[PDB]
Amino acid sequence: FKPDARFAWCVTGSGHLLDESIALALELPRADLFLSAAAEEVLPLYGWALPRLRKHFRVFRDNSASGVPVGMLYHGMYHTVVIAPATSNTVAKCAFGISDTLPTNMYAQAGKQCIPGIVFACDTEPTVVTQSPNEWVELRPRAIELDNVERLSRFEYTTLVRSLDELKAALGERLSTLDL
Amino acid sequence: FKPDARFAWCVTGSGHLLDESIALALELPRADLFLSAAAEEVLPLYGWALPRLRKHFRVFRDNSASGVPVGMLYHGMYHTVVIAPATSNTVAKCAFGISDTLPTNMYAQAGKQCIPGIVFACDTEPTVVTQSPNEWVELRPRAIELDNVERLSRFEYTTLVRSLDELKAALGERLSTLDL
Amino acid sequence: FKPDARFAWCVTGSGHLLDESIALALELPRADLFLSAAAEEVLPLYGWALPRLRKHFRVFRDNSASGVPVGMLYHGMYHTVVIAPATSNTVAKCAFGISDTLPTNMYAQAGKQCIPGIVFACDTEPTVVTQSPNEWVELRPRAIELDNVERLSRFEYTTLVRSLDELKAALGERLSTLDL
Amino acid sequence: FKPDARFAWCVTGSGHLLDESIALALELPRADLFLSAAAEEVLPLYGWALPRLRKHFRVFRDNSASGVPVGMLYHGMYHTVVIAPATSNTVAKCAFGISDTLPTNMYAQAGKQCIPGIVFACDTEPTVVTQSPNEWVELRPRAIELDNVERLSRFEYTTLVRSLDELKAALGERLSTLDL
Amino acid sequence: FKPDARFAWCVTGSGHLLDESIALALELPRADLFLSAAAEEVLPLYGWALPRLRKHFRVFRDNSASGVPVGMLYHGMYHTVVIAPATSNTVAKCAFGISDTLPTNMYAQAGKQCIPGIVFACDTEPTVVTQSPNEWVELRPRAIELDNVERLSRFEYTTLVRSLDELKAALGERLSTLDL
Amino acid sequence: FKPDARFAWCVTGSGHLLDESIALALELPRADLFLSAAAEEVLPLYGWALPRLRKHFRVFRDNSASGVPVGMLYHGMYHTVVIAPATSNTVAKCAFGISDTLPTNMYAQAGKQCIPGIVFACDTEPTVVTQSPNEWVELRPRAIELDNVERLSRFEYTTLVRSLDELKAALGERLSTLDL
Ligand SMILES: Cc1cc2nc3c(=O)[nH]c(=O)nc-3n(C[C@H](O)[C@H](O)[C@H](O)COP(=O)(O)O)c2cc1C
Ligand SMILES: Cc1cc2nc3c(=O)[nH]c(=O)nc-3n(C[C@H](O)[C@H](O)[C@H](O)COP(=O)(O)O)c2cc1C
Ligand SMILES: Cc1cc2nc3c(=O)[nH]c(=O)nc-3n(C[C@H](O)[C@H](O)[C@H](O)COP(=O)(O)O)c2cc1C
Ligand SMILES: Cc1cc2nc3c(=O)[nH]c(=O)nc-3n(C[C@H](O)[C@H](O)[C@H](O)COP(=O)(O)O)c2cc1C
Ligand SMILES: Cc1cc2nc3c(=O)[nH]c(=O)nc-3n(C[C@H](O)[C@H](O)[C@H](O)COP(=O)(O)O)c2cc1C
Ligand SMILES: Cc1cc2nc3c(=O)[nH]c(=O)nc-3n(C[C@H](O)[C@H](O)[C@H](O)COP(=O)(O)O)c2cc1C
Ligand SMILES: Cc1cc2nc3c(=O)[nH]c(=O)nc-3n(C[C@H](O)[C@H](O)[C@H](O)COP(=O)(O)O)c2cc1C
Ligand SMILES: Cc1cc2nc3c(=O)[nH]c(=O)nc-3n(C[C@H](O)[C@H](O)[C@H](O)COP(=O)(O)O)c2cc1C
Ligand SMILES: Cc1cc2nc3c(=O)[nH]c(=O)nc-3n(C[C@H](O)[C@H](O)[C@H](O)COP(=O)(O)O)c2cc1C
Ligand SMILES: Cc1cc2nc3c(=O)[nH]c(=O)nc-3n(C[C@H](O)[C@H](O)[C@H](O)COP(=O)(O)O)c2cc1C
Ligand SMILES: Cc1cc2nc3c(=O)[nH]c(=O)nc-3n(C[C@H](O)[C@H](O)[C@H](O)COP(=O)(O)O)c2cc1C
Ligand SMILES: Cc1cc2nc3c(=O)[nH]c(=O)nc-3n(C[C@H](O)[C@H](O)[C@H](O)COP(=O)(O)O)c2cc1C
């Protein structure tokens, strides 16, 4: 990798722990953001519109079908790919080798080049989504979500994490490895 | 249970997600706190000294060897027992039927009376503990921690949860069941 | 054993059949009582405060972390160890080789010296606890209680009994063996 | 670890080979002692009262329920945890992930942080305890003691040793690794 | 069942826990007694002669070969059949479908009509029978007694209980079911 | 055996725990020493030259190819054979039925006559041998040593012990059996 290589932090269209995920990315020494089309829609709804993101990050939008920004991986510009948060959709696509979004292309190309990937899968446990003070909706991962997490966790050069704490740990191990 | 039955929320000597756990307890309609001896030492270190807790809760300290406050379970005063956060130590004791602290006695007696228990086990995944801005310690659960979580998760009338989100979901299901 | 060796009768913090257990101990030719910390709290609630016990027995309280009174086993002063009643907690500790109370230390040290132990396990069957004339609570042993009884029943030099009648029988066999 | 990191040598309430264990600790370049409550009672009976220990060691007593001194592990102050001698009780607690004493908390926290532990289990073989010149008591480990030693010996980052000689060897290997 | 349906409490010729069994029957809201021929002989020997029983109960003697009083089951007069205490003899007869006494006919006819039966089997554990202050006889259940208890415990609409405590629990569950 | 029968204590050319082994032999009521050729060379190096040994013991040197002193076993002069310490070499020879030294002949002939043998095998665990204050050598038993210990431990009339404590226990049991 180049001496000043960076984290490639991909964001998908997940509202789940989105703010906390960006908060962690903010703590990293050098990271650029790579968005899916859905992320670009979802991020403004949770406090992270593009103009705010660009105060802190270089931000690459998903505006090509071929995933043109992934070409930077060939130039040693990114030492690690992160997907956080990862929608169930993106976990499914990664697990089956589908790459038709910027984050799934970044992940697949990283793997082909033996670049470490860290994937924060957010559908491993039940959760609660509230609308009013005394009304809420419980979400429960389905068999397919759980199976896809298991599938992806077995991938080469991939650390699948299931919580913010574990994401922090994976990032910390990567930083230690890179002597950063 | 009595018409005005409450949550029995037990706290153990865990700094891990302690503040967020108390925050959830604060949201419940009626809950009393039951501390281990270690909790009484640890809680003040993280912003929850007894005088602050007592502004919001009835608080029972672990000051008897026999677990005298557990007698209230026999009077239909508590419809649910929670342990959150639960130290690895308390998960181990619960898993093997040891009850020599107020929280482990509350849990065991609940089970014998078929009162639902919800246990927030905090040692299921790696995590990071920081001391200085650029120095930190990674913790990793051992086989025994993982095995004990598996053991306890199989207990009658017990919902073992592994995250704050899942704890919220379990609490929400309980509230729905009780029509609260 | 010394010519005038005695029964070492350990009491734990169990209200269950406590009065009947002490009644049986009273019938034995020479027995001393060894209490857990919880027993010292529970016994007065059921008619057996320390001053009443001391009219009939030498009574050893659990007031050392190391279980100092157990040293008397090394001097041939006790030919038999009894635990009656035994809490689920003490059955669990005995079953896993934990000895951090006077009764569990007495039991473990007895075993290491091949001194017969008799353990009255009180959580083998459902029971009823009453509060008012027409209101009561049913207790039901959990899998862990049943499993721990099975575990402990297999121990060397150990007779696990599940009723007062069977405790009487075990005591009677011991008396016959000792020609008392 | 810090440049001047030390051995964390835990002592439990075992009279067995206690004097020889302290003798070995005395030979180590830098070691602090961490006592259980039972150790504090037992040590004076065998020639090692606290004032004598403190001529040679920093000594931490077990005077908190939460195991406050273990916090020093997070600061890289101890490169190794030793438990020697280890009572059957402490071996049992370690084997099942119970940590409610200073030594068992030191051991568990070491493991979670991948700090090497060395445990001198003293109940692996029959032994003789004498009272008078021509009278003595044979002790024999029970199945549960032997099983617990086997269990603990399989733990991550743990070297279970069964003799003083093997403890010396383990310490020597650790010193060689640390280039001390 | 009729609105004022009763317990049909059968007594067999067992001296074992007979007084305590009648004591429990006395606590039930509405119960009639149904005796075997042997019960009629044994009951007076233990404090419960027919005239004393009839101060508290309607009492049906076993004075017909066909078990004429069992006809009352067809009229919805009894919501539950109890046998307590049950001799080994009556447990054996029930287990093999033999009905040639009033209690065994009550039990079999209850089963055919899907009326719940509760059977207190008294030969599951060793016990002691005393004659003089320092002389006694130990009884031990044989394989056939243990096997027959296992057999009967599997019967439809049957709760086999092995202690007074468990009998109380079964009765309590029945009362709760019947909203009594 | 003769009324004044003795222990036949064999010594091999082991420096390991040699001084402590002789110390135990000194405590026995009546024991004679039987040396291998290697023992006669090694003993003076560790404080036990023949003239010192002969102040306390009758000492038989290995100065015949046929093991002439073993003839005393035929005359009921020795009730027990001990080998302590036993070199790996002597454990190997005993395990395979080789008897071409005084100790291995004493052991084999004892076995053929059903005379109890106690063998202190010293190669069951790693150990440390020091030369200078800060330099030492670790020894580790090989598979063949461990296998041979297992083999010999299965021999008729043989108690294989792996520590000084266990040797003391075996000797104590023998003394108790012989009412000495
Ligand atoms: C269309 C939509 C889909 C969502 N899907 C998920 C999901 O798959 N998993 C999840 O944990 N939360 C999901 N959420 C919840 C958001 O991530 C987040 O919690 C936020 O509070 C949304 O609030 P709201 O759905 O009530 O409008 C979803 C929200 C929306 C609007
Ligand atoms: C406000 C909002 C919040 C959402 N949150 C989630 C979520 O937390 N997890 C999830 O799997 N999908 C969530 N979705 C649905 C995804 O955006 C949707 O599946 C999309 O196709 C994901 O595409 P992507 O994986 O390429 O980013 C959300 C949708 C909306 C509109
Ligand atoms: C003695 C001690 C034990 C701890 N044990 C754990 C643990 O088992 N699991 C965990 O997630 N955090 C553990 N922590 C971390 C605290 O829960 C919490 O994260 C806090 O930040 C402690 O900061 P500090 O250890 O650096 O002093 C422990 C902290 C201390 C002092
Ligand atoms: C400041 C501090 C923080 C701690 N945090 C944790 C923790 O997050 N998880 C854990 O298993 N133990 C933690 N410990 C250790 C426990 O307090 C210790 O094991 C204690 O025996 C637990 O007892 P309890 O389960 O009855 O509450 C901590 C200790 C201290 C002093
Ligand atoms: C805190 C507490 C725990 C008890 N635990 C048990 C138990 O595990 N098993 C049991 O048979 N009885 C148990 N009991 C019941 C007492 O042993 C005894 O039956 C007595 O009647 C207690 O009355 P009470 O609980 O209504 O106050 C418990 C009672 C209390 C107060
Ligand atoms: C009034 C009272 C009665 C209790 N009765 C029982 C009981 O019958 N059985 C039981 O397992 N625990 C019972 N407990 C709970 C035990 O006292 C508790 O588990 C304690 O930790 C036991 O410690 P020990 O085994 O060392 O004596 C009771 C507690 C109280 C306050
Ligand atoms: C209460 C007590 C418990 C003991 N437990 C053990 C033990 O579990 N294992 C052991 O090898 N020695 C044990 N010992 C023996 C001491 O560790 C030590 O050998 C010392 O000589 C004790 O002498 P004494 O028991 O005759 O008073 C115990 C001694 C006492 C007093
Ligand atoms: C004088 C004395 C010596 C003891 N020696 C031993 C011993 O050698 N081994 C052992 O397992 N227990 C021994 N015990 C019993 C332990 O001290 C007891 O089990 C205690 O609960 C251990 O607690 P700990 O493991 O936290 O230190 C001894 C007790 C006394 C009073
Ligand atoms: C003929 C006879 C048979 C008995 N059978 C039993 C029995 O099978 N099981 C039992 O627990 N007790 C049995 N007992 C004991 C009585 O139920 C009861 O305990 C009473 O104390 C009888 O005293 P006794 O036999 O010494 O005369 C029997 C007693 C007698 C006389
Ligand atoms: C005084 C006395 C007490 C008895 N106690 C018992 C007993 O406790 N258990 C038992 O199985 N048989 C006992 N028997 C024997 C039974 O009465 C005998 O087996 C009889 O045939 C039982 O008939 P039944 O089951 O129809 O009532 C006792 C007999 C007598 C005379
Ligand atoms: C030739 C020789 C062989 C030895 N073999 C062993 C052995 O097989 N096992 C052992 O525990 N010690 C062995 N030792 C060590 C001695 O038994 C003893 O520990 C003593 O301290 C020897 O010191 P030194 O070897 O440094 O000269 C041996 C020593 C020597 C000189
Ligand atoms: C000073 C010295 C110490 C020795 N210590 C040991 C020892 O501790 N264990 C061992 O297996 N061999 C040891 N040996 C090697 C044995 O003496 C050697 O294998 C010899 O052949 C043993 O013969 P033996 O079994 O008939 O006595 C030592 C040798 C020397 C010179």
Short mmCIF file of N, CA and C and ligand atoms in Angstrom, two decimals, chain B residues 66-72 74-75 109 112, chain C residues 14-17 46 88 122 127-131 139, chain E residues 165, ligand 5:
data_model
loop_
_atom_site.label_atom_id
_atom_site.label_comp_id
_atom_site.label_asym_id
_atom_site.label_seq_id
_atom_site.Cartn_x
_atom_site.Cartn_y
_atom_site.Cartn_z
N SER B 66 -28.49 -14.10 53.16
CA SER B 66 -29.59 -14.97 52.72
C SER B 66 -30.41 -14.34 51.60
N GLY B 67 -30.17 -13.07 51.30
CA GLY B 67 -30.91 -12.41 50.23
C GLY B 67 -32.33 -12.06 50.67
N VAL B 68 -32.44 -11.51 51.87
CA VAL B 68 -33.74 -11.17 52.46
C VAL B 68 -34.74 -10.43 51.52
N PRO B 69 -34.27 -9.47 50.70
CA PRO B 69 -35.29 -8.77 49.88
C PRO B 69 -36.03 -9.66 48.88
N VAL B 70 -35.44 -10.80 48.54
CA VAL B 70 -36.07 -11.73 47.61
C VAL B 70 -37.42 -12.26 48.13
N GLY B 71 -37.63 -12.18 49.44
CA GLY B 71 -38.91 -12.52 50.03
C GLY B 71 -40.09 -11.79 49.39
N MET B 72 -39.83 -10.62 48.82
CA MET B 72 -40.89 -9.86 48.16
C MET B 72 -41.45 -10.58 46.93
N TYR B 74 -42.32 -13.61 46.86
CA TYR B 74 -43.39 -14.48 47.35
C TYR B 74 -44.69 -13.73 47.53
N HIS B 75 -44.63 -12.41 47.48
CA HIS B 75 -45.83 -11.62 47.73
C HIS B 75 -46.38 -11.00 46.46
N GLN B 109 -34.66 -17.60 42.59
CA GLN B 109 -35.99 -17.68 43.20
C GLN B 109 -37.07 -17.37 42.17
N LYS B 112 -37.67 -20.55 40.24
CA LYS B 112 -38.39 -21.58 40.99
C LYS B 112 -39.89 -21.27 41.05
N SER C 14 -31.69 -22.46 54.55
CA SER C 14 -32.93 -23.01 54.00
C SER C 14 -34.03 -23.02 55.06
N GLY C 15 -35.18 -22.42 54.76
CA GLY C 15 -36.31 -22.51 55.66
C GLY C 15 -37.04 -23.83 55.47
N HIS C 16 -36.71 -24.54 54.40
CA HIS C 16 -37.48 -25.72 54.04
C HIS C 16 -37.15 -26.90 54.93
N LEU C 17 -38.16 -27.38 55.66
CA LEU C 17 -38.00 -28.48 56.62
C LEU C 17 -36.86 -28.22 57.62
N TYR C 46 -37.30 -18.98 61.93
CA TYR C 46 -38.10 -20.21 62.03
C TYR C 46 -38.03 -20.89 63.39
N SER C 88 -30.39 -25.05 47.56
CA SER C 88 -29.97 -25.36 46.20
C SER C 88 -28.57 -24.79 45.97
N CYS C 122 -33.08 -30.42 49.27
CA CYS C 122 -34.49 -30.06 49.40
C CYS C 122 -35.18 -29.53 48.15
N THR C 127 -43.21 -27.82 45.57
CA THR C 127 -43.76 -27.62 46.90
C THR C 127 -44.60 -26.36 46.93
N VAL C 128 -45.25 -26.12 48.05
CA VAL C 128 -46.15 -24.98 48.21
C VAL C 128 -45.69 -24.14 49.39
N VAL C 129 -45.64 -22.83 49.20
CA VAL C 129 -45.32 -21.91 50.29
C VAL C 129 -46.53 -20.99 50.47
N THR C 130 -47.08 -20.95 51.68
CA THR C 130 -48.28 -20.15 51.91
C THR C 130 -47.97 -18.82 52.59
N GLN C 131 -48.77 -17.80 52.27
CA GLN C 131 -48.66 -16.49 52.91
C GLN C 131 -49.92 -16.18 53.71
N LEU C 139 -43.52 -23.63 44.26
CA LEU C 139 -42.14 -23.68 43.79
C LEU C 139 -41.91 -24.97 43.03
N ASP E 165 -45.27 -32.54 50.35
CA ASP E 165 -45.11 -31.24 49.71
C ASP E 165 -45.62 -31.27 48.27
C1 LIG G 5 -36.18 -15.30 50.36
C2 LIG G 5 -36.90 -16.66 50.53
C3 LIG G 5 -36.46 -17.74 49.77
C4 LIG G 5 -37.08 -18.99 49.90
N1 LIG G 5 -36.63 -20.02 49.13
C5 LIG G 5 -37.21 -21.23 49.23
C6 LIG G 5 -36.72 -22.36 48.39
O1 LIG G 5 -35.70 -22.15 47.45
N2 LIG G 5 -37.28 -23.58 48.49
C7 LIG G 5 -38.32 -23.78 49.38
O2 LIG G 5 -38.87 -25.03 49.46
N3 LIG G 5 -38.83 -22.72 50.18
C8 LIG G 5 -38.26 -21.48 50.10
N4 LIG G 5 -38.76 -20.46 50.90
C9 LIG G 5 -39.86 -20.70 51.79
C10 LIG G 5 -39.35 -20.90 53.24
O3 LIG G 5 -38.36 -21.88 53.20
C11 LIG G 5 -40.46 -21.33 54.19
O4 LIG G 5 -41.32 -22.22 53.54
C12 LIG G 5 -41.27 -20.18 54.87
O5 LIG G 5 -42.61 -20.53 55.07
C13 LIG G 5 -41.16 -18.82 54.19
O6 LIG G 5 -42.38 -18.09 54.20
P1 LIG G 5 -42.51 -16.84 53.20
O7 LIG G 5 -41.62 -16.93 52.02
O8 LIG G 5 -43.85 -16.65 52.61
O9 LIG G 5 -42.18 -15.52 53.80
C14 LIG G 5 -38.14 -19.16 50.79
C15 LIG G 5 -38.59 -18.08 51.57
C16 LIG G 5 -37.95 -16.81 51.43
C17 LIG G 5 -38.43 -15.62 52.27
#
